[PDB]
Amino acid sequence: DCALDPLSETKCTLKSFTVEKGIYQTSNFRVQPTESIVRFPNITNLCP
Amino acid sequence: VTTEILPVSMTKTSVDCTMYICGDSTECSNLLLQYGSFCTQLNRALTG
Numbered sequence: 001d002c003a004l005d006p007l008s009e010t011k012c013t014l015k016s017f018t019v020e021k022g023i024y025q026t027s028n029f030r031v032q033p034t035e036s037i038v039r040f041p042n043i044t045n046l047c048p
Numbered sequence: 049v050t051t052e053i054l055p056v057s058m059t060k061t062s063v064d065c066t067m068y069i070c071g072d073s074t075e076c077s078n079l080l081l082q083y084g085s086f087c088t089q090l091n092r093a094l095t096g
Contacts, residue, residue, distance in 0.1 A: 025095070028064050030072075 065090050 002012035006026065010019055013026040065087035070076030080087070 025062075025091075028067065 062094055063090070 002009055007019070009026045010024050011017055013024060066077060066080060069087075070080055
């Protein structure tokens, strides 16, 4: 399972069940958005 | 006494191919999946 734990993710990245001693970059972390925002101008009159 | 200047190393760079190409879009990511393993090759080369 590639998303169980870092070792399994490494095994999937290398596509192997044995991992040699070393350091491997398996993925990329990035913060996810907390909420969405909409900022439109305060306009009310409907277009004719 | 004379000087000899020799470069030994240069800057170690990494590029998240899937983020340079598709910043955070998942449509673009799903569409880039069908190019195979170009991104993995590029990251492998830069890591080397």
